[PDB]
Symmetry: C2
Subunit: 260 residues, 2 copies
């Protein structure tokens, strides 16, 4: 039966490659050197960044910290569509109750967003605009409160997550496992969701044993990261609320706010 | 093989220690709850008068809801002591840096407390006073705010956790796994903790495979429960903060205070 789990693993990797333009392998090459990205490490470099390279998530449409924070939201929305497309390639997903598909994505995309963002981070900063740029951790941390601490929690997670040394083929299955979570609020038919996830989990276990035979209990260690992920998401929602209640300079064009 | 042999010996050691440390097992709780016998019937507390007769029938201020809350504190402290005793039996634990031993218990005890409290619960209520009593979930909800909803999320977790149908032999290893968590804040020496947990995880994996061979991915499902646990603790802390502000006349136990401090 093992043949089916390997076919699924390959299937998911291929789809993952199709859906996500910037892979972990590509991002690592850039991050470590082997090539080159424009570095944003302060206000002047940010501005040159905008001018020479035109980071579309920083395009016109104000205060720097606010525009950066909004740029994050813009890219996040963009990423949701890549994930949605990936989801439809997971065997069984499209066959689920349509409301459940919506629910699974609604609750799953944030977890997936921060998982994949780790692929774009090291302890020193993060790749932006399709790897064209690299924004430093310290520059982000330097932003005025409450924006100074907005990315930092993701960096902390990424550093820990990245120590697992997962590759794209590992991540493709993990992301699938995240989407097929049977505990999302408001699901109408949990059974086929858990059944698909049980299959993904089997596929994930084998992939990790085959791909990382030396890494004892990697499967267990990866599953444990779900705690870290959800905590990051919860924490992000909490900040969004704060800045929405306080902060008076956040508004965009009403259609832009609707979109994002 | 020799490797599996060592993991089985580990599982046996932990189960043995668990039975030695925890006076009310899940096996006994279930026997009491399934109410199949004549010697183990609990007195059921479901309102005020039946409460008032409890204090007479069962052997354990002049207020009401504080009494239940403080009875619950006392039990929690007792549970910490049982769990601390169990921890010492986990191979390698007492050999760790002393500061890390404290840290591991500080963050681990409540996750374990709610994990094990599930054993004493069904959708209708919870065993109390070493199984001699049973307090209904509805009664607990009938309590004045903020007390009125301290337990509900525990009940919610329990019903879904209990669907895994774990037994004590499984639980002994799982709680060991929880304690030996290398990602507790402020740990000095993460590696030796992680090394211990890895072997515990191996033992847990094998245990579930042998004990529930028909239960697909039970190992993974169990591990995902650890985020449910973290979240219950999170809620409980905030609920406590609210209490400390509305109920200035209510004492909290010093041990519990220290555990929650800067958590
Ligand atoms: C009683 C309902 C649920 O039980 C909980 C619930 C939670 C915990 C752990 C929790 C306790 C706590 C309370 C307040 C502040 C801080 C902690 C925790 O430590 O987080 C234990 C327990 C265990 N409690 C008991 O066995 C128990 C013992 C005695 C009584 C009781 N005694 C007299 C009159 C009525 N009831 C009730 C309950």
């Amino acid at each position: 039966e093992s043949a089916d789990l390997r076919a699924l693993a390959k299937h998911l990797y291929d789809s993952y490659i199709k859906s996500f333009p910037l892979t972990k392998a590509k991002a690592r090459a850039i991050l470590t050197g082997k090539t080159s990205p424009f570095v944003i490490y302060d206000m002047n470099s940010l501005m040159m960044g905008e001018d020479k390279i035109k980071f579309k998530h920083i395009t016109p449409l104000k205060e720097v910290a606010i525009r950066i924070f909004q740029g994050c939201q813009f890219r996040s929305v963009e990423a949701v569509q890549e994930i949605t497309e990936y989801a439809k390639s997971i065997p069984g997903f499209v066959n689920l109750d349509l409301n459940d598909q919506v629910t699974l994505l609604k609750y799953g995309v944030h977890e997936i967003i921060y998982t994949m963002l780790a692929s774009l981070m090291n302890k020193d900063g993060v790749l932006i605009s399709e790897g064209q740029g690299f924004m430093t951790r310290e520059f982000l941390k330097s932003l005025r409160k409450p924006f100074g601490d907005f990315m930092e929690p993701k960096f902390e997670f990424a550093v820990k997550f990245n120590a697992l040394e997962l590759d794209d083929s590992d991540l493709a299955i993990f992301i699938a496992v995240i989407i097929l979570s049977g505990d999302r609020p408001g699901l109408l038919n949990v059974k086929p969701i858990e059944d698909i996830q049980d299959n993904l989990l089997q596929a994930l276990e084998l992939q990790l044993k085959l791909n990382h035979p030396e890494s004892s209990q990697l499967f267990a260690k990866l599953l444990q990261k779900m705690t870290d992920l959800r905590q990051i998401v919860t924490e992000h929602v909490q900040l969004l609320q704060v800045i929405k209640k306080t902060e008076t300079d956040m508004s965009l064009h009403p259609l832009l706010q609707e979109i994002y």
